[PDB]
């Protein structure tokens, strides 16, 4: 479960950097 | 022991609270930004890529007008630092020492 | 409970004194940063948005409407300084609504 | 913008000793022992 | 002590701003500070900017040395005198309501206990709430007792302490009483532990409190907020702002 | 003996005309002091009234009176720190210095009492420091810092221009409850004004001089009508050494 917190939030940060280029350019 | 006033089974669908806490800010932000978390103020600032400190200081001196000039900047820094880890800077450090 | 209430008094007074914040008074700043990282900004675009939020601060006023002239519908808007401008005068606009105890200057 | 002074009729709800009780009841329900650190 | 300096200084700032609030007030002579505070209160940052070459803006003149500075009074500004006015007006209003609610040599509780008993259950609850709110003061200042209109059924006679002098008009409240918690008050109490020698004023003034006068105040508000010209002006402004909204939304077609 | 002689009393070159009443009354006091001091050490808390580095037997010379400074120090600051140790001892912010309670319960309503207490506490600390019994001539690393800012085709009266600005913002504060600090904003100086409930650390500035314009701060010495004379007198008892050696670490 600790790794699960860490996984969920790192993939959310990946999603954020994906949404960066997909929304502004 | 579960610390005092720290709620365990608190969700996001659980309505938002009112206390200006690091936990409160962080969970409200979890609702708000969806998933953005910064390891400091400066991760946010590297994300914003060229927005200086004053570039938000003026924004907030406008946004809430009863705030004074440097106090706008302070709200800036503080919400950063509260959704982050507090910053390592000679500003805060000379504050601590002088004080 | 005693101390928590005495702060809950000062937690009202400092708020109504303006320079103090809370959850739905800083949640907009959580939104500021949210969309600043969502729809990226350059500095001068930030200064344009800041002047936007200083023109939506001391003059923006509520009760905004929209058309669906054949059909129209109106509902209330976000805060400002002007909603204080209108709540300081009983919402009458005439600052001489206090017909009671008060000193006068002639 | 969201001015602070405006939302008041809620900020005296606190310093009213009616919500002091209705939230100190919650704080007392919470001071007890709990065996769940996270969800 | 107010007629010493503030009542002597205010009437020299009143005649010079009554121009700049002509759209608010074109009356002339009959302006109570309860009108100066309300209109000449919301001291703007962009609307009431400092007028070019302002000395209390350029940090060359103290905001307290305006009503004597004729060189400013010649070409004044709005906020650069709206604040000075919003302080002195408010100060004299505090002292007004002060001497008016303090003249309690007369032992007259009235059907005022009825009001407060409806609101609490007991009137000692009231004296206690009122002493707590003034002792628990974030600043040496002024406490107020006021009227609210959104729950005026039973839950009305509501106390609140405000900043140093900001009177509960600027949030649209109807003041009914004051209490003097300022440092000039506490230093007078000293002449005889702060958390004690301000309860020595809380539960002292809530007994020196002339409640009769305040009952005239409560019925004054129960007449203002219960008259019809209130509905008139409120519906008028509610249509004025609604039309100003509709015309603006139908602009750029 | 210094450790037993009660915390306010004053031993003397005893007069030897010490009457029985003369002795019995002071013992009655000392026994009162004893239990109030065995009471202080359980009413007590994390923070304490900062000691001052100078005598205040009489008044801080040519600025303030013995009675006036003992008013502020003994009652109002002791009040501030006492309510601070009422308020922080026992909340999620307990027992880290003012420099972290200020900054982590700053700009907040739901902890407004907390932040107000904290900032006022510091404020008193710094006024205390910034005084000095007979004034420090503005030093040579400092006067030039003020030349770089407030020299406009000027003469040796540039620190006088800064004193001018001091008095100016003293009086441009009107509530008569607050603090006027000369600071260093991280880019330049500016005499900032201060409500009751704020400090230069809530304002993120480097406090370089601390003035106390609370109505109570001079009510007894000159009254509210002598505020200009006070904002002047404060400069025969300010500490520009404190000012300057804070400014230098401020810059670099
Ligand atoms: Zn100006």
Automatic annotation (TrEMBL), chain A:
Highest taxon, organism lineage: Eukaryota
Protein name: Mitochondrial ribosomal protein S18
Organismal lineage: Eukaryota, Discoba, Euglenozoa, Kinetoplastea, Metakinetoplastina
From TrEMBL, chain B:
Protein name: Ribosomal protein S9
Organism per entry: Trypanosoma cruzi (strain CL Brener)
UniProtKB/TrEMBL annotation, chain E:
Location of the Manganese/iron superoxide dismutase C-terminal domain: 118-183
Domain of life: Eukaryota
Single Gene Ontology MF annotation: metal ion binding
Keyword list, A-Z: Metal-binding, Signal, Zinc
Binding site for Zn(2+): 50, 54, 80
Protein name: Manganese/iron superoxide dismutase C-terminal domain-containing protein
Annotated organism of origin: Trypanosoma cruzi (strain CL Brener)
Residue window of the full protein shown: 14 to 313 of 449
From TrEMBL, chain F:
Domain of life: Eukaryota
EC code(s) of this entry: 1.15.1.1
GO MF term list: metal ion binding; superoxide dismutase activity
Occurrences of domain Manganese/iron superoxide dismutase C-terminal (ranges): 159-244
UniProt entry keywords in alphabetical sequence: Membrane, Oxidoreductase, Transmembrane, Transmembrane helix
Root EC class: oxidoreductase
Protein name, UniProt field: Superoxide dismutase, putative
Naturally occurring in which organism (per UniProt): Trypanosoma cruzi (strain CL Brener)
